[PDB]
Amino acid sequence: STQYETQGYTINNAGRRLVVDPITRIQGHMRCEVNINDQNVITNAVSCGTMFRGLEIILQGRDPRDAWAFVERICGVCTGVHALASVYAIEDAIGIKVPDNANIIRNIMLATLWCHDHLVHFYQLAGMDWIDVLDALKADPRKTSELAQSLSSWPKSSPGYFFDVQNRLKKFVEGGQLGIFRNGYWGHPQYKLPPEANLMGFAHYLEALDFQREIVKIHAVFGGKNPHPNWIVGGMPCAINIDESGAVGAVNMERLNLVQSIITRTADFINNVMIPDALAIGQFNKPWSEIGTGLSDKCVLSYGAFPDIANDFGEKSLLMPGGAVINGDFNNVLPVDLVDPQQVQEFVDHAWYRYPNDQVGRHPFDGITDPWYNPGDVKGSDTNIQQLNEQERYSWIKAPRWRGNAMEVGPLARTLIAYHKGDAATVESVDRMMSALNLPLSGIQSTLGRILCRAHEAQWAAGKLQYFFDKLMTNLKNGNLATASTEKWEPATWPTECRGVGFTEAPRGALGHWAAIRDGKIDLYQCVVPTTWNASPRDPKGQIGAYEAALMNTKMAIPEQPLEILRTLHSFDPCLACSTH
Amino acid sequence: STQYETQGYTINNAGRRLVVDPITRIQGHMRCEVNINDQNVITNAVSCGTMFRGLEIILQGRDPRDAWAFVERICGVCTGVHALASVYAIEDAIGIKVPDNANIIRNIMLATLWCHDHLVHFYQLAGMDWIDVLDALKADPRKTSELAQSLSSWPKSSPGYFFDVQNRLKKFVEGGQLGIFRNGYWGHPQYKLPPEANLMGFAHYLEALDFQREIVKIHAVFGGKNPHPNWIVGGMPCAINIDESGAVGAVNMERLNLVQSIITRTADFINNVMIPDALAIGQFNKPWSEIGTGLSDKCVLSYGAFPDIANDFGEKSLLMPGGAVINGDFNNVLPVDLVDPQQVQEFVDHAWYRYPNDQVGRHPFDGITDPWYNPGDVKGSDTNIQQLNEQERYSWIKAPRWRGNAMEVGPLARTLIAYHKGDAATVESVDRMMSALNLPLSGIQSTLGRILCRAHEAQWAAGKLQYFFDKLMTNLKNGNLATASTEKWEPATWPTECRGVGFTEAPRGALGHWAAIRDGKIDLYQCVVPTTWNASPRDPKGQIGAYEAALMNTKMAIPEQPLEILRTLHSFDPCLACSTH
Amino acid sequence: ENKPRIPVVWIHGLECTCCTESFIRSAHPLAKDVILSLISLDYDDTLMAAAGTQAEEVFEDIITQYNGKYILAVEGNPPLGEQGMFCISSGRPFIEKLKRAAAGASAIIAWGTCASWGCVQAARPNPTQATPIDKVITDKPIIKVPGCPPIPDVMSAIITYMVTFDRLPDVDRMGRPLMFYGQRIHDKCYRRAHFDAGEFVQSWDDDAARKGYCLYKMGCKGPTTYNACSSTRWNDGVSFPIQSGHGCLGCAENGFWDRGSFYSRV
Amino acid sequence: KPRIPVVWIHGLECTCCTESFIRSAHPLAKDVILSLISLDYDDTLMAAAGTQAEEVFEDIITQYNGKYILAVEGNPPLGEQGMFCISSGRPFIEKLKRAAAGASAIIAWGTCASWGCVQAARPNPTQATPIDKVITDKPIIKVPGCPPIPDVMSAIITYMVTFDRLPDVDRMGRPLMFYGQRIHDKCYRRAHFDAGEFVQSWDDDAARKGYCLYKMGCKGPTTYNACSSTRWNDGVSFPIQSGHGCLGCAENGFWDRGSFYSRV
Ligand code: SF4
Ligand code: SF4
Ligand code: SF3
Ligand code: SF3
Ligand code: F3S
Ligand code: F3S
Ligand SMILES: [Cl-]
Ligand SMILES: [Cl-]
Ligand SMILES: [Li+]
Ligand SMILES: [Li+]
Ligand SMILES: [Mg+2]
Ligand SMILES: [Mg+2]
What we know:
The complex is a heterotetramer, with two copies of chain A and two copies of chain C. By secondary structure, chain A is of the alpha+beta class. Chain A has a single domain, classed as Orthogonal Bundle (Cytochrome-c3 Hydrogenase, chain B), CATH 1.10.645.10. Chain A contains 16 helices and 16 strands. The radius of gyration of chain A is 24 Å and the shape is globular. Chain C folds into two domains: 1-180, Rossmann fold; 181-266, Cytochrome-c3 hydrogenase, C-terminal domain (Cytochrome-c3 Hydrogenase, Chain A, domain 2, Irregular), CATH 4.10.480.10. In chain C, the strands form two sheets. Chain C has a five-stranded parallel beta sheet with strand order 2-1-3-6-7. In chain C, strands 4-5 form a two-stranded antiparallel ribbon. In chain C, β6, α5 and β7 (142-145) form a beta-alpha-beta unit. In chain C, α1 crosses α6. Classes of the chains: A alpha+beta, C alpha/beta. Chains B and C meet through α1, α6, α7 and α8 of B and α1, α2, β2, α3 and β4 of C. The structure holds iron/sulfur cluster (2 copies), FE4-S3 cluster (2 copies), FE3-S4 cluster (F3S) (2 copies), chloride ion (CL) (2 copies), lithium ion (LI) (2 copies) and magnesium ion (2 copies).
């Protein structure tokens, strides 16, 4: 065994080794290993992406106009975000400006995805880490009603409703076909909710499973379908016609009325179901405000998103702020430049790839994706891994760094950047949440904080949906209908050689696509995706990424039942297909 | 001025004359006049249909295959029922038998209509007679929640929900544009609900307004659209294909899944919102179990409906029983025959029509629709009716009688007929309902009873939707897909001269279409519609119809504010376009 | 700030109420939201609490106070026969109520084929001499929204357009909104592939019918009918006549009832 | 009344097929899971992880050997000894073969499981391979599209449960009900196609009237699916209705059949 120090941690692989493979209630394939000491505390953590497809290789030689459709298939959970980044990147390369309504509609697509993806995460992915579903069978339906009504104005709270939900669950389990609940962690001492809170939460899980399907109707109107809506370089394909012949063939008043109905319902559900449930999890699990901090008190990154001035990706335009903090220096938020070769770089010394020099990082315009499965001296076999060797290569995920620093990305990162830049809405939301919990600001820098920030962002994005819809309507009232710029549609109009960057904030964090075009075709297409950051393996200095750091120093009650590991990992909403692409 | 006795009533047109014109919260156009004595009790009541279109005239010379589409436009509220009666009539004339699935689908169409029409009546048409909308502003939202939860398992019962509803109404009223509530009867002494029940009921009015739109999606699947779905002579046009190429062009598994989802939701709403509200209206308005009896303790009529054996309209097939009771003789339900010229007849001595002899009745196969607007002295002019002359012609509605008896039709009539025929489901539903209210069975024969029976029937019909859907699925599982018979589609296959009757139970009561075909065309098409019975004017013996009888002997608290008249008329769900056609 | 909504007066002539019923089917905005938040529905015999003299008082108060400022919605039509007394409101011909309401209106919406053209009561031999609104009211803007009834979400889209944009929809030569009536059913029908291939239903429930073939030979009037049914569809997009296997009747077009049998080819 | 056991496994995939499934409008996915099937293994939804999830997998495929439906999302890579997709430390293809051996029938959800989809597009770095090239001794129902339509997925499930049989299929294993006709055989813009009325550039006057997307690269003429009839997301739209041509996403090899914007 060995021990070394990095980023304030002592990484020590002595002691019992625990493996969690497969990690469930994430997207894609992940393996996690940890070592624990005599106190059942994690002293080493190992994040491994266990899949690869090679989109960066597949995109070579494609028409830049087609790229969005390929890269959208990086992920069907964060569906649309890679298409947005791609159209942005190609437009940046060629020098295309889209019309205002196209930008507004793209912002609507993004905000819709934030609402959907964050809602479903909270219930379907992370919820069962916090709610003991089987314990709901012990609840008193009238006390459940009283609890719910004390927390929210949401209408669906009758004792009879909770009895009905409880009976549905009782019937579901009474034949012994427990389905997704089979061999769960139910009864683990870290489940702290009373039975009535478990039944309320489970009712809400079911309501969210039903309701989430509605949110994406916005994507269907503007983008044709969800998952995997359509886009174009130059704007959007959803031509508008409000008051002329043939409006039946376009986005018309009836289509926009549908969108407005979805927005209102989405805000209502988030504000009155998800938000009070998130605060309630906080109230009953306050110790988790001090667990899973990881890098979130050291190094956090946002590129920023939601340009409100069309084609302007600067600070005055982006409604979701960008910036970086390193070394805990939150009083000095730093600007990010995605073209600067000294800022974003990826390392592969601990990943299954070849570089000419694996001791250095490569900016994505110099990126190389040359897969090389070489796990080295594993316990077991290279086709039946008992233990990865974290001193050698151990993942399909590259290791991104910002100026050489390991960063956390995602809702907590964004919230911290925006807070410290003085964004009034963020400051107010954070301050109110932490005051409600009687917790210091620092309590957000935690596993619990990641969940609270995600809920805050779902509410933020639902508000932004209305703002964007209103801006679209204002344009239509002023006779501004355009949705596509086509002057540069034809390849003869492009520079013979050009390159560009498309960036945004996906639900899980900072996303960039770097594209080089030559002779009408993609010469290079490199993606650095939020879970690539968070699930990163180590670098040549031994620095650990966000997941490994967040797992460090965590107590486990029952080593064989890894609920604490699941809680922390799920709090980041891991997307492993995203991370590896 | 004059007095006479009929049917146990003393019809006396002395005293103050009150006019209510227009009658609102009905379909179509009606005028009602009454006389009241010095105790403000109605001693004379006059029912006048104030519209006519002449469908029986328009149908002459049409292709029998087209007839359904024309007569469906008798009414957009009981939409579909006239199409059903029409295809039944034409099939009866020609000698056409439809396939089982067509019959099952037609029964689904009818049950859908019952659920929709009854639900909307309860809330949108009659509800404001019972619920004081302004008084809802005084309610305590917590007490409202407690009330609602004591009555039902319905989920939507939180104090915050009731507060939100109340607050929206409060701000609507503060704005000063009272809309549909302006100049209403709010504060009348006959409003007996406490504030919390008014708020509960108003919330449910709005939930029903929203939900009713969903019910008719079943009509859209099988019939293309609602209002006014499509039908064919020979079955239905909605060809089925479950497992073959091209199922995308037909009623397929996805379409049937949609139908099933609507059925479940429909039953849930009716059972958990409408039913408990109807019982709550009963609990707070028990004196109305003794008001508005009219003909319901003397003469009631049903034709029967919902043939379960395809093409069999006999007693063993019809799921909703037919029969007649006269002279209060409920122990002897009498058989009805729609071809017998001595049974159903229409009189016009008090109506705006010409007959060769207006002192006799004509069976519909001898029917005549020769309009003649002749009001006599109405204390104004022909274009200014100040006082209808009920001693002469006073209505566009013909006067139907059964064996010369004046009958009530509709939900209460059907419930009494089924009860007294010994239908177990009806006997149990009715006894349990009257027990819950601690009222004798006789309390059903009243204005309150009409409303209770309507709610019972909505519940019944929602159950029957599932029964019929299951029957359809059973056929499909057995490979029996047929939806149309076309052997006799072509006019060359028809008898040169033939006639037929189509009958059913519309939401409002017994419906018949009598059709004669000659040389490929409609030679005669006579309709007798439920509100024609109930809203009937007098006959040569001076016998009064169901509305006039129900209004007789009613106390009015405030003659100028005719809430009691509205309550009783609305309890029959008047459809004036139906009545006059 | 409690802010007023545009006054709307909805009157009914000879009609079946299909157009009111269609309105309340609206999926987006819900009719509830239209009434509570978008317009002020100030008179409507189908829904209002007041009856008789109380309803007459509402009608008089609104058209007086809001003279020149309310939208008049008309469902149904006036009959000219029997001195107008085939449709009687407050003891007098409906046409008198129509004219009074029209005189104070800023604009008129003629809902449905009844108000637009005549519909079923005007079909041969038109016993009541039912007459469309634009032949009686000749000095007001009239937007025709035909169909029997028009599509629910077309009705609500037209209302929302008028409120949101504060203007009348642009119209064709017959006064129909271009947005929903500019193209034919058959110009947007998903069975056009079959039409163009000569793939037709020939009798009900034949193999062609079970594959969704074209309904031309079963009498479909889609080729001559302007409406949105094949694109917007009905009842929250669930279906339309042709999708459920019956040819278009032509119900949005003037005189459709008398343009031959529904089962005779265009 | 026990519900039919279903084991849902994931190879290389983006999860669009799982996500599509949960969009189902009728029956709701909730109701499928609670009342129609027993969803006994699913990495995206299940509570258990790691050794607990492995225990569930082993128990279910043993107890219900010969009786469970296997749903497959994604595909196996043959490159690097299969270690481009690793589950429980071993190549995913081993899990696929074990699950397949006990299945009564297999549903290949989506273009990934059916044909290969994006990872199998040129130059197919991982040697991603559709499941019918690996599993050759079991009934496989292909339900292609990227992803398939939500209510098509749930209709196929309901058909199988209600009728207690597999849907009838074409010669490629696709359910005739939803894949028997082409997009262009039921497209509401066919009137324009027939008339030679085409969008020529995005947002041109033709585009604003809903003209045909053939000249913009629509692949509807060569693509079998239900999008133009059933539509997407509770019938709200489909690609062409919202102004983009069909990509061809239900067809084998559609990524490599030229640019999306090249005419068919
Ligand atoms: S079904 Fe009617 S509207 Fe559709 S293509 Fe055929 S004829 Fe035209
Ligand atoms: S848009 Fe595509 S599928 Fe539709 S008619 Fe044109 S080419 Fe065919
Ligand atoms: Fe629509 S009220 Fe019904 S009949 Fe044809 S529109 Fe009229
Ligand atoms: Fe549908 S997992 Fe998403 S990539 Fe194309 S189907 Fe695969
Ligand atoms: S009958 Fe009418 S509803 Fe539409 S499809 Fe034809 S215009
Ligand atoms: S791209 Fe796919 S979703 Fe349908 S319209 Fe074409 S098959
Ligand atoms: Cl007409
Ligand atoms: Cl493929
Ligand atoms: Li018969
Ligand atoms: Li008054
Ligand atoms: Mg990359
Ligand atoms: Mg008659």
